[PDB]
Amino acid sequence: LDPLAYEIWMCIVFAYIGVSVVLFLVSRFSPYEWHSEESNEF
Amino acid sequence: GIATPKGSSLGTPVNLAVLKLSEQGVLDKLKNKWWYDKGECGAEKTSA
| Number of CB atoms found within 10 A of residue B6's CB | 6
Collect all residues of chain B within an 8 Å Cβ-Cβ radius of residue A4.
48
Q: Which amino acid is at B7?
A: G
Helix (H, G, I), strand (E, B) or coil at B15: helix
Say yes or no: B45 contacts chain A, CB-CB below 8 A. Answer: no
Q: Terminal CA-to-CA distance of chain A, rounded, Å?
A: 31
Method used to obtain the model = cryo-EM
Which chain A residue is nearest to residue B48, measuring alpha carbons? A3
CA distances to A11, A21, B6, B37, B44 from A18, in Å = 10, 5, 85, 57, 37
Q: How far is A3 from chain B (nearest CA, A)?
A: 5
DSSP 3-state of B17: helix
Contacts A2 to B, Cβ<8 Å: 48
Contacts of A24 (CB under 8 A, 6+ apart): A42
